[PDB]
Amino acid sequence: SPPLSIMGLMPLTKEVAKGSIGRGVLPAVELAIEQIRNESLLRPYFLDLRLYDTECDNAKGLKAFYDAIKYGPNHLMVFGGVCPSVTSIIAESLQGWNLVQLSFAATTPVLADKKKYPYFFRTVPSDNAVNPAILKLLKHYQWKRVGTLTQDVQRFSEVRNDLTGVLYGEDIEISDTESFSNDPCTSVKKLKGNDVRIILGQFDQNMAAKVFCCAYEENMYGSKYQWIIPGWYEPSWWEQSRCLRKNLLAAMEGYIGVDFEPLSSKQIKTISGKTPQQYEREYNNKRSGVGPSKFHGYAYDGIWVIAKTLQRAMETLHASIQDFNYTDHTLGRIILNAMNETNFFGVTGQVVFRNGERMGTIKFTQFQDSREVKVGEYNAVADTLEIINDTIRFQGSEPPKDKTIILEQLRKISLPLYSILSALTILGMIMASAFLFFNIKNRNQKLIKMSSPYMNNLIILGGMLSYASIFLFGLDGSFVSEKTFETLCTVRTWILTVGYTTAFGAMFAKTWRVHAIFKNVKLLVIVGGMLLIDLCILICWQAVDPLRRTVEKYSMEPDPAGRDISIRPLLEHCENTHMTIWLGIVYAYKGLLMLFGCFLAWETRNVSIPALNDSKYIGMSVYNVGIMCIIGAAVSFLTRDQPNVQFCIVALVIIFCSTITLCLVFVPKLITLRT
């Protein structure tokens, strides 16, 4: 029985950290060879593994590899290698000796290249094997906006650089890209500035607590945000500081950890004749001295791959091993093609190599309040994701979307308030029509003939046109159209200034003729000239810069509904060109005319008996109509943002201003003409 020697390199001391891996798979490989000798897989010969300790160091590993070449027997292929640097040094140099290497723990992506390392094969999936998993998670939840948060080590920069190249060609954009070295959360504040809710974190075990407590200080959790991080951390890793524990446990709820799957679940018979569960119980009975490690199934599949490759190579050679020196290379090409042709079923799934990488399975886990639990899997051979339905949950009800939805939600005015004010002004309209009917019925009278009743007809028509404006005031928003609004406001400012000008010109002309008759110790051209001036400024308004619709928008502040969308409240206005020119001139001209009329009414202060019987209450009405019009225009300047209020207070000011001056002219008429 000639032996078949296999070189094994693994950390086998207790003084290093990753040496805890190297002992932990030593039962399982011991479990495998005893099967291959029992069935007599290598009938012509028998397998023999020779162990060597590299101690996870470049110099020690290179010296041990050289001593294993020099003093040991004729090896055929290398098995093992755990640390990334020592595997890099050996894997670059295998080709000079025509040896093929098979790893089970080298998870670095650098060994994916087949120009530098052409004789390398591993059975553990790499660190880039999570990148076509997260993609097929996003298409399951239709998320398309993501934001990456990367640590500045090479080990994570390779993963991020592969993710960039694998998201290309799809309907997924990378709205933000970040990096940090020691300061985590100015970067997550910049991520909060763009307001993204899907984060693909890539960072080690130390910075995770810092990122999550800095998110708790930023309140980046709840049923809005989603975290997707690696899942090869230690169990209960949160216990080892400054941050508060229960706050961290409330901030860390609901992340998705991505990892490689330790053992398969599809309970079929493998190539050894067992189940995954039987193998797990056997290895658990074997491992009684030491703790477990998550690489043992991959070591089992590696031993079976080595055995099947040697069997295929022997069957190929006998159709033309104990004489193999490193000077041969045709035997190396034979063993290389035989390992390239590997396709079978083992305890971790369908063992198959594509370009020197294992096409294996990826495991998603989610954190629930004390522990992480398996919430799905992704088979990368057939490219399919399987999510267990009744285990994955969120805080809210729906899977949270990437960006919030904006809504217009125009600010309207209350129909009860509008109806109440329309009723008030329509009863004022009835009162004004009743006063006009009385004064036109009692025309021929020796009290009405000496009181200039045509000017009173002018003041009733002015009050009528002032009353009629409130209907055209505030037909805004959700009431008529989008095209009447460009004409309704210009016809409103057409009618309102005429209704003001007629009445105030009548009262001012009455007071002016009182002063002119008093001084010397026909009519109707004054209001004609004033109407001419205001119609001129109105046609100059309409012909040059007409008032049109213009919308103002707020900054999307409130969220009052609870349906988790943002609303952006917006208002309508009739103002388009300059609005500090054609309002300041009109307001200043009307204010100066008002103050001149008020001073002229004070200068008499009721000394004239014979010609006009009512100059007293006419001057009282001028006084009246000035001050409340001033406070109405001032309060209109004050609350130029809020709607229900300014319409109501302008309506109250105008109904008071038009119902008091219609009382003070015609109320003595009723008392003296009924008596």
């Binding site: 110099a59 290179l62 040094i89 670059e92 140099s93 000079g96 530098k116």
Partner: protein, 683 residues
């Protein structure tokens, strides 16, 4: 002659990325003869060489290092080639206790005494350009630097040492970039960032792309200066390359006048080394042994260094022979410690000059600084760094005679009113003040005669003394920088604010009450007149006191957009205009202007009302109405204009003081000349 052997293992790269061993291999062997013939040093030993090709590839250097370390003749030192092979060999040689003495490894990562404990090299590291660049930054006063970079790790460690070197000399990097194969977007960001001191760090085949992209985006020129690395070929822009849409006659204007720095291998002097040899005869002797020309073989420039490397080892075996060397095995740690202490302190004169190592294993040497000047390089200086000796040679031909500066400088010029329009209006104001005081004295002199005693005394005098101060309030309206300095702007400001307000309020209050009382007595007693005047003046000084309390006035500078001088070619000039203001200057005089406008418009109507229906022959005015007419038409036309045109330099002062001199001339002409035309002309 016994002449026992001592062996030296070596890896010479015959091909690959840096084919140095085509020239470094004979230059070692020739040098070995010069140690084996001279009987002064190593009198009984004989150095022999065992070499292997390595192709600058660790995948074969590992096998050849196994062949060296595990065969019969015991080696005593190792001599690798490229950077990667030397990294592998120097990290691996700790477990066998071997000195590693490279000759061509220029990584900055090999100066880590923690990782590589027994390393020595004679090629200096690529962190020797950085003291030369720091010295060339302190010499010309530059203080802001942009760095573009190809993302190979050697350039990354070079810049990460440059930052630590430059932050202790008061200079700071403002801009970093990186690229892999297409330099378009970093030169775009360099164009939009507008930096002018660039330190480029990339290989040749990227330089031929990035410099004609610099030409296409027009980043070169009069105000720009680059910095490159010096071991390019001397016609690296004049060669043809189909990977760019750029022309050979083009980009020769774009690489114009860029400084390069490089290590100097061969000794520029002509003295004698320790081998009794000079530089030119060393090149002449070496050119015999080569089978080709020096321009076509690789590694010709590094071939001196290997020479000195051999000589260094020879001296390190002369200062220890006194344990013998025919007994060195791979386990005893002692003899390597003797050799390490002997080679830690080494200082001699070889073909490359003064050879002496650092404390981290590197080699300190000179630096050459050259510049492109019209298509060909020109040596413009040398620099020693271990004792800080610059050697300039007066050849830095710039474009404007002087080196440009990093950023454009701002000039905060001021803008003052022309002094002729100040001085003419001030002398008109002094003519006004003498006319006012002579009219006041004339009216106060005839205080008994019943033409002005019965009409209105003590009121026109008050109008005149109000207009006196109102005319005197135009001297502090034109004192900003040309005749006054600073830190008394509150004095001039409170002066102009109290003086003009007091004068106008007093004068118009008097002339307003003289119309108000005749109106209120015509339509059906000096104490009530004095009460009205004092009440108006008290209310006006009350609101000026409220101005004094809440928001006082101080100086405030505004500025316009920048302009161009067009006597230099690069200065940025911004104009500054300073004036008195407060935080609420538009409203806090808007109230005063509106109140005075309402008072003025009240007065003009009564002045028209009591025109010729006076019949009030106890006042005898008839022309105070005209004195209110002209002041009302003149102040209301220059009150909003001097707040509209406040951005203009001198038109505001012109209109304000012109209105003030007209409105104080005419109110004294039309009020006082009939008071003397009827008395001391009709006398």
């Amino acid at each position: 002659s016994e002449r026992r052997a001592v062996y030296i293992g070596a890896l010479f790269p015959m091909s690959g990325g840096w084919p140095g061993g085509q020239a470094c291999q004979p230059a070692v062997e020739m040098a070995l003869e010069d140690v084996n013939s001279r009987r002064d040093i190593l009198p009984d030993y004989e150095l022999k060489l065992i070499h292997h090709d390595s192709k600058c590839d660790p995948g074969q250097a590992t096998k050849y290092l196994y062949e060296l370390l595990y065969n019969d003749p015991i080696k005593i030192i190792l001599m690798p080639g490229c950077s990667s092979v030397s990294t592998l060999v120097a990290e691996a040689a700790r477990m066998w206790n071997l000195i590693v003495l490279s000759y061509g490894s220029s990584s900055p990562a090999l100066s880590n005494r923690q990782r590589f404990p027994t390393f020595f090299r004679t090629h200096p590291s690529a962190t020797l350009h950085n003291p030369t660049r720091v010295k060339l930054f302190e010499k010309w006063g530059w203080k802001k630097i942009a760095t573009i970079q190809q993302t190979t790790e050697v350039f990354t460690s070079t810049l990460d040492d440059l930052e630590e070197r430059v932050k202790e000399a008061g200079i700071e990097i403002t801009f970093r970039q990186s690229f892999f194969s297409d330099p378009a977007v970093p030169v775009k960001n360099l164009k939009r960032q507008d930096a002018r001191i660039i330190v480029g760090l990339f290989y040749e085949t990227e330089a031929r792309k990035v410099f004609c992209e610099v030409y296409k985006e027009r980043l070169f020129g009069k105000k720009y200066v680059w910095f490159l690395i010096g071991w390019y070929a001397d016609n690296w822009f004049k060669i043809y390359d189909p990977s760019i849409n750029c022309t050979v006659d083009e980009m020769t204007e774009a690489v114009e006048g860029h400084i390069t720095t490089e290590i100097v291998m061969l000794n520029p002097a002509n003295t004698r080394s320790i081998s009794n040899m000079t530089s030119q005869e060393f090149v002449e002797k070496l050119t015999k042994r080569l089978k080709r020309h020096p321009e076509e073989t690789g590694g010709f420039q590094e071939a001196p260094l290997a020479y000195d490397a051999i000589w260094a080892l020879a001296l390190a075996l002369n200062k220890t022979s006194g344990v013998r060397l025919e007994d060195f095995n791979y386990n005893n740690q002692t003899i390597t410690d003797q050799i390490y202490r002997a080679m830690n302190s080494s200082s001699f004169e070889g073909v490359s000059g003064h050879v002496v190592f650092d404390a981290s294993g590197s080699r300190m040497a000179w630096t050459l600084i050259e510049q492109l000047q019209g298509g060909s390089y020109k040596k413009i200086g040398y620099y020693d760094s271990t004792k800080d000796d610059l050697s300039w040679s007066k050849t830095d031909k710039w474009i404007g005679g002087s080196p440009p500066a990093d950023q454009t400088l701002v000039i905060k010029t001021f803008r003052f009113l022309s002094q002729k329009l100040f001085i003419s209006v001030s002398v008109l104001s002094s003519l006004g003040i003498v006319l006012a005081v002579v009219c006041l004295s004339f009216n106060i002199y005839n205080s008994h005669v019943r033409y002005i005693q019965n009409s209105q005394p003590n009121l026109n005098n008050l109008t005149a003394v109000g207009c006196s101060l109102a005319l005197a309030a135009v001297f502090p309206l034109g004192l900003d920088g040309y005749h006054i300095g600073r830190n008394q702007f509150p004095f001039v400001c409170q002066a102009r604010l109290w003086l003009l307000g007091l004068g106008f309020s007093l004068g118009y209050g008097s002339m307003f009450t003289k119309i108000w009382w005749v109106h209120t007595v015509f339509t059906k007693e000096p104490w009530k007149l004095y009460a009205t005047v004092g009440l108006l003046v008290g209310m006006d000084v009350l609101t000026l006191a409220i101005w004094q309390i809440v928001d006082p006035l101080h100086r405030t500078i505004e500025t316009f957009a920048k302009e161009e001088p067009k006597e230099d070619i690069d200065v940025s000039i911004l104009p500054q205009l300073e004036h008195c203001s407060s935080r609420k200057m538009n409203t806090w005089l808007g109230i005063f202007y509106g109140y005075k406008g309402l008072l003025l418009l009240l007065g003009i109507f009564l002045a028209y009302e009591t025109k010729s229906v006076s019949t009030e022959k106890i006042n005898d005015h008839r022309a105070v109405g005209m004195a209110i007419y002209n002041v009302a038409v003149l102040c209301l036309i220059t009150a909003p204009v001097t707040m509209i045109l406040s951005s203009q330099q001198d038109a505001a002062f012109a209109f304000a003081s012109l209105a003030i001199v007209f409105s104080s001339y005419i109110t004294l002409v039309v009020l006082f000349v009939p008071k003397m035309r009827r008395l001391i002309t009709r006398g």
